[PDB]
Amino acid sequence: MDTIAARALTVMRACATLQEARIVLEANVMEILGIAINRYNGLTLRGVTMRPTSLAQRNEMFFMCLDMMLSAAGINVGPISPDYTQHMATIGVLATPEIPFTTEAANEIARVTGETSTWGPARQPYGFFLETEETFQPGRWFMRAAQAATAVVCGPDMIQVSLNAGARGDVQQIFQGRNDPMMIYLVWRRIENFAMAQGNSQQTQAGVTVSVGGVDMRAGRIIAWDGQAALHVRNPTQQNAMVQIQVVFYISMDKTLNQYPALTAEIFNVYSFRDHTWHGLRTAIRNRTTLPNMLPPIFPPNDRDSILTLLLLSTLADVYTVLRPEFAMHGVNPMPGPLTAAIARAAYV
Amino acid sequence: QRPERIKTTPYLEGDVLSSDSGPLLSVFALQEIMQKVRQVQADYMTATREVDFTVPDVQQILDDIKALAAEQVYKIVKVPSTSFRHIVTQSRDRVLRVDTYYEEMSQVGDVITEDEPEKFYSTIIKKVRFIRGKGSFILHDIPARDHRGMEVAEPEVLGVEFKNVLPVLTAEHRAMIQNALDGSIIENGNVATRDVDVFIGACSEPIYRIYNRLQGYIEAVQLQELRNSIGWLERLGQRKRITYSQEVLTDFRRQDMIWVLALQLPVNPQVVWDVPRSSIANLIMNIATCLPTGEYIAPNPRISSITLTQRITTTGPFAILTGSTPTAQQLNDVRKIYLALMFPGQIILDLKIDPGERMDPAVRMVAGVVGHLLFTAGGRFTNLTQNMARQLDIALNDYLLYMYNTRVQVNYGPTGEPLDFQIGRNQYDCNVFRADFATGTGYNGWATIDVEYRDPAPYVHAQRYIRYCGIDSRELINPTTYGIGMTYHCYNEMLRMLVAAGKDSEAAYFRSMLPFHMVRFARINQIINEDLHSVFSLPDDMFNALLPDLIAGAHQNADPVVLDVSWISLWFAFNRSFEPTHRNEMLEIAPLIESVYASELSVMKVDMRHLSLMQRRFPDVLIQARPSHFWKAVLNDSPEAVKAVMNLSHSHNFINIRDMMRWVLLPSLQPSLKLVLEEEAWAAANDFEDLMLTDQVYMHRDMLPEPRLDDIERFRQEGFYYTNMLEAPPEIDRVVQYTYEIARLQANMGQFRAALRRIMDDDDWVRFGGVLRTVRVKFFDARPPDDILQGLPFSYDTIKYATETTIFYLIYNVEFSNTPDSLVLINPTYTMTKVFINKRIVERVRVGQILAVLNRRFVAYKGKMRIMDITQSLKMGTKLAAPTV
Amino acid sequence: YDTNEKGGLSYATIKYATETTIFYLIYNVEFSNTPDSLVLINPTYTMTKV
């Protein structure tokens, strides 16, 4: 199954080699394309050249890549163009062990399937306390009634604890709740000058200590906090104190944009406009998928199919670039003018 | 021109020894195996049925099979067979039609008797075959006559004989019929172009059935089917590296040509390998078809001795290597060796000892070593016999131990078993070069992979592809790793040992020989898994099974052929390399031959199948049965060539009842035009009445219908025909059922007549079930023979059942000189036997009704068109313009 | 490009040339010539260009 994708990939990547005639094909490439194109034509009954030039020759080749790309992704776009028609049989060509694939493509897929099928530790994208409904002014004193120590949120990755003179207590519970963090990296500082309930300035005296799981930790240093250990703050000083604990960053088993090498750039490439034909095409393709038809998904996908589809579409994009195919689509109206950032902007709904 | 044959350096360019070919070896093989047996059986006390181990002509048998592709089953006519006839009575208003079919069928096979079951079997086959033949129509160019703006069929293309009737017809009846004649038109008629003519003509049902099924085939099986099959060859072409033509197959079909393909190409591997005791025959076929032609090459004389000065030259440690080949007596003995390894574990090797010819014992040494690095006893498949190997280890051992120079430290092992010691100033086990079949630790590919499954195979029995010493033929085309080091593990270890122990002087010979050795092997591999994997190749299943089954001594259906060699031969085999010249001409047509064999094969299986059921269908008819009987009668009516392919090994004199039963019950078939026709005609055969033999035979004392003649002119009636064939059977409650056994007993006791009489007197009926009886139909003008009227369904000379049973039709004719009661007799005339068929054989008809027979469809190819069987165009070197999957 | 009918099938053969000729056709004229003389109702075609 992965083999199928590797093939369809190799083919496309190979077609991209066909820049503008003045080329002497890499012997290796010839062999591959020939076998593929051959088999494809034997199932498509279409006339694909190994070295296109006319346009109609180019279209045919693109269409091939398209048919393969879709088949490798397991997509059925249906009646989207009068000029193109998807042959479902394309899958049978790709399933035939008679077509080879590059080491490049093999590893490329192996990586996607490899990671996509399991989990791993990864630096998360945003601030820890991002999904919070309430926030308090930073540096401002706040003690909940009947408490000697009161920890609270003041930002996306910020919390501050209000300690009374001589007061102490555990804080970890403010962090817990958000499903699953594997290791939170902290750094706490003393709020040397903070606002009182009334507005007057107040100083935090040197001596306030913070200990994780018992062991005492310095201020301004990063800490490997397991999220479970006791986050204990003490105030041996004879004055009010306020310390800020910062979640510099944390790691979790949620998929980030670093699951697959430079995935970002690929996605960019996929979502890029190029022209109305490409745009509309790429749109119509993702309409079959769980992916946003024309705007970068907020949350990085985590399933084989998604990642895969993107890679294929990304490559098929480059193929579109080199081949310069020209055809129609239902609902697409090509504006021939030179094309500006303006015209592009407008295209996105 | 010469792809890999390109000889870069003189090192490979040696002398020519001999040369072999497909048909050459294929014969030789058989020969050797046959001598084997005579020489033993004739030699020792033997006890078995006599068999004549003859070596048949492989070429002529093959050539005969290639000749089969020609023989077509379909027969092109311009007019259909009659089908119906009319027999005129005295009457002028009524006639009787007859379904010709039934008459012909009546007299097809021999009469049926409970005595000869074999007779019975063939009798059936002939009958079935008959049907299939009577049904393979084509109807090309029909007699289309013009009449009133319509094109109608000429009465000749219809299915009736009515000319007899015409003269007795009333102006009215005549007219009616005439309209019916110019009634049946050519449907499409006024169209031109057309291609086909559709009319109405009459036809006997069973026959029609075949005509139709056929017609369908020729229209269903076109371009695509052909396309696929050719593509298959086109694919196998690449596997066999075929030199291709500049031509291509245009799937252009002319508007004149209707194609008739009779065999499809992707052949079912199993049908070939299902044949019991085939192994040998198959193998030989594999040789005779795929094994190319080539010559054995000698190494370079410079590999051993080299001249430094006119006076100074080096001498190879083996000066004995100047021995002129021990006649063909042993040259052939070498051919055995090559052929043996060229066929994995299919052929095993063994010593052979003539107590005569005294050889120098040194021969054993060399051969001990040689054998070790040229034969594969690897735990993957094995070339040698268990005892064969021991003798080589003993040869090796005995000779590692023969020190013609200063002796080295031999530190023996506790076991008396040869090769326990550790000769060498650095020790080194010689125990490694022992002989484990599950490991292959001594001989070839001891640390190598020689069975490499890889790539989908164009054949499918075998997907495997052999790498002796892990050398892919590719290393020839383009090297893999230098020329210095080519060494595979074993040959390498062999060297190390030769050094540590005895001496380098010899190890140097093998060191320099090494490349020559591997080259020979690389070519061998190429030849095996490329040049000759055919249907007869042999499934990986059985291949893998060979080794372990050999160790346990199972009962491998594919018992490997054990060939006996000669100590000397090893040296000779080692110093010859074989380099292929031309691929045998049989190769490009091979697949086709295969299809022919396989398809003809299956057809037999089918026939036999249904025949086995026969015994259970009517256990009373064939008491003395035995499967051999039908399978013998089937083998009888089927093509010689095929039979001979099976009997190459002389299997036919060994295949036990059980063995054959299994093959009938096996369910792997190869479709063919012949196949579908046979099966379809065969199906209609299941009726039995359509074969003309019934269980419905009764006895009932009956009077001969003597009528009153008051109005003679009123005998334009049905001419009052009589007939013992029943309109419908009697009420089942009024019938005394009789069995073979019941009748038998009563008769042996001498009570049968009595009982029979009583039943007759009581006006009751008696049926004779269990047995079939051939049924015949005769017609009479007057008082037929008593042996017919009062004819009985059994002999009384013990009561012998069956017999022929004649269904007569007695027509009453009378002149005006007949008195009303003139037909009466003081005493009645009796008729006993009566039959029932539930098939309208002879039927009373009006006159205007005569033409009602028409009925049947009918499609006839217009005269313009040409029917051609594209069946022999299945050569390998043909490529198509439309690539296919 | 050739087409051959065998059996029923009909095969075809397509070969590409190996030789190519470049030529220089010098125009030679005389005084008895009319401005018209060199023009013909229908053109004369040349297919190979290198």
Residue of A nearest to B227 (CA): A42
Please indicate whether, in this complex, the C-beta atoms of B884 and A42 are within 8 angstroms of each other: yes
d(CA A132, CA A155): 9
Half-sphere exposure of B565 (CA within 13 A, CB side): 28
B267 neighbors B591 (Cβ within 8 angstroms): yes
β-strands B830-835, B697-703: how paired? antiparallel
Amino acid at the residue A89? A
Residue A227 and residue A135 share a domain: yes
B775 neighbors B694 (Cβ within 8 angstroms): yes
For residue A126, count CB atoms less than 10 angstroms from its CB and return exposed for 0-12, middle for 13-18, buried for 19 or more. Answer: exposed
User: Nearest CA to CA, how far is B590 from chain C (Å)?
Assistant: 20
Which of A120, A147, A180 is where one domain is finished?
A120
User: What chains are in contact with C, requiring at least 3 Cβ pairs below 8 Å?
Assistant: B
Which residues contact residue B705 at a Cβ distance below 8 angstroms, ignoring those fewer than 6 apart?
Answer: B720, B722, B812
User: Nearest CA to CA, how far is C41 from chain B (Å)?
Assistant: 40
Q: Which of B227, B252, B866 to mutate to test the interface with C (most CBs of C within 10 A)?
A: B252
Beta bridge partners of A163: A149, A241
**Interface check A49 vs B, CB under 8 A:** no
Residue A248 and residue A125 share a domain: yes
Angle of the B205-220 helix axis to the B117-135 helix axis, nearest 10: 60
Which of A226, A253, A280 is where one domain is finished?
A253
Which residues contact residue B709 at a Cβ distance below 8 angstroms, ignoring those fewer than 6 apart?
Answer: B715, B814, B818, B819, B820, B821, B822, B823
Read out DSSP for B724-780? SB-SSPPPGGGEEEE-HHHHHHHHHTT-HHHHHHHHHHTT-EEEE-S----EEEEEE
B434 neighbors B393 (Cβ within 8 angstroms): yes
Alpha-carbon distances, residue A65 vs A288, B41, B236 (angstroms)? 18, 70, 29
Please indicate whether, in this complex, the C-beta atoms of A39 and B456 are within 8 angstroms of each other: no
User: Nearest CA to CA, how far is A315 from chain B (Å)?
Assistant: 26
**Interface check B882 vs A, CB under 8 A:** yes
Residue A288 and residue A193 share a domain: no
H, E, C per residue of B678-734: HHHHHHHHCCCHHHCCCCCEEEEEEECCCCCCCCHHHHCCCCCCCCCECCCCCCHHH
From chain A, the residues in CB contact with B885 under 8 A are 39, 42-43, 92-93, 96
User: Nearest CA to CA, how far is A41 from chain B (Å)?
Assistant: 8
DSSP H/E element including B514: helix B504-526
- Interface size, chain A vs chain B, as Cβ–Cβ contacts under 8 Å: 16
From chain A, the residues in CB contact with B458 under 8 A are none
Read out DSSP for B121-152? HHHHHHHHHHHHHHH----BS--EEEETTEEE
Residue of C nearest to B254 (CA): C8
Residue A262 and residue A249 share a domain: no
Query: Residue holding tokens 């001990």?
Result: B368
User: For B868, which of C7, C13, C15 is closest by C-beta distance?
Assistant: C7
User: For A39, which of B456, B882, B885 is closest by C-beta distance?
Assistant: B885
Please indicate whether, in this complex, the C-beta atoms of B252 and C4 are within 8 angstroms of each other: no
* CA end-to-end distance (rounded Å), chain C: 22
- Give how many domains chain A has, as a whole number: 3
User: Nearest CA to CA, how far is C18 from chain B (Å)?
Assistant: 16
Alpha-carbon distances, residue A277 vs A66, A174, A280, A334 (angstroms)? 14, 51, 5, 7
What is chain A's Cα-based Rg? 29
B484 neighbors B560 (Cβ within 8 angstroms): no
Tell me phi and psi for residue A190, to 5 degrees. Answer: -95, 135
d(CA A120, CA A254): 8
Task: Quote the DSSP letter at residue A274.
Answer: S
Residue A197 and residue A267 share a domain: no
From chain B, the residues in CB contact with C5 under 8 A are 254
Per the structure block, which two tokens stand in for B97? 């039609």
**Interface check B38 vs C, CB under 8 A:** no
Amino acid at the residue C10? S
Distance of CA B38 to the CA centre of its chain: 29
Per the structure block, which two tokens stand in for B650? 């002389």
Residue A142 and residue A191 share a domain: yes
**Interface check A39 vs B, CB under 8 A:** yes
User: What chains are in contact with A, requiring at least 3 Cβ pairs below 8 Å?
Assistant: B
B842 neighbors B97 (Cβ within 8 angstroms): yes
d(CA B502, CA B419): 14
Distance of CA A150 to the CA centre of its chain: 37
User: Nearest CA to CA, how far is C48 from chain B (Å)?
Assistant: 24
B299 neighbors B669 (Cβ within 8 angstroms): no
For residue A113, count CB atoms less than 10 angstroms from its CB and return exposed for 0-12, middle for 13-18, buried for 19 or more. Answer: middle
Residue A239 and residue A259 share a domain: no
Please indicate whether, in this complex, the C-beta atoms of B247 and C13 are within 8 angstroms of each other: yes
- Beta strands in A154-303, from DSSP E residues, in sequence order: 158-163, 168-170, 183-190, 193-195, 201-203, 209-212, 215-217, 223-225, 231-234, 241-252
Residue A58 and residue A154 share a domain: no
DSSP H/E element including A3: helix A2-15
From chain C, the residues in CB contact with B870 under 8 A are 7-9
Q: Furthest-apart CA pair in chain B: how many Å?
A: 134
**Interface check A96 vs B, CB under 8 A:** yes
- Beta strands in B546-645, from DSSP E residues, in sequence order: 561-564, 579-582
β-strands B859-861, B293-297: how paired? unpaired
Sign of CA dihedral B597, B600, B601, B602: positive
Residue A176 and residue A215 share a domain: yes
Instruction: Give the domain extent around A189.
Output: 121-253
Interface of C to B at Cβ within 8 Å reads: 3-15
A159 neighbors A152 (Cβ within 8 angstroms): yes
Which residues contact residue B351 at a Cβ distance below 8 angstroms, ignoring those fewer than 6 apart?
Answer: B387, B388, B391, B564, B565, B567
Q: Which method resolved this structure?
A: X-ray
B798 neighbors B766 (Cβ within 8 angstroms): no
SS3 B436: coil
User: Nearest CA to CA, how far is B241 from chain C (Å)?
Assistant: 21
B450 neighbors B525 (Cβ within 8 angstroms): no
Per the structure block, which two tokens stand in for B683? 């199906």
Residue A298 and residue A262 share a domain: yes
Please indicate whether, in this complex, the C-beta atoms of B259 and C8 are within 8 angstroms of each other: yes
Which of A120, A154, A181 is where one domain is finished?
A120
**Interface check B882 vs C, CB under 8 A:** no
Chains C and A touch (3+ CB pairs under 8 A): no
Residue of B nearest to A90 (CA): B885
- Beta strands in B470-602, from DSSP E residues, in sequence order: 561-564, 579-582
Residue of C nearest to B880 (CA): C11
Which residues contact residue B554 at a Cβ distance below 8 angstroms, ignoring those fewer than 6 apart?
Answer: none
d(CA B178, CA B850): 11
CATH number reported for the structural domain that contains residue A347 in this entry: 1.10.170.10
**Interface check B885 vs A, CB under 8 A:** yes
d(CA A162, CA A244): 9
Residue A268 and residue A176 share a domain: no
SS3 B477: helix
Residue A202 and residue A125 share a domain: yes
Cα angle for residues B337, B340, B342 (degrees, 5° grid): 110
B556 neighbors B545 (Cβ within 8 angstroms): yes
- Cα-based torsion angle of the residue sequence B77, B79, B84, B89 in order, rounded to the nearest 10 degrees: -140
d(CA B634, CA B606): 10
User: For C8, which of B246, B247, B870 is closest by C-beta distance?
Assistant: B870
* Chain A from 131 to 160: CB within 8 A of any B CB: none
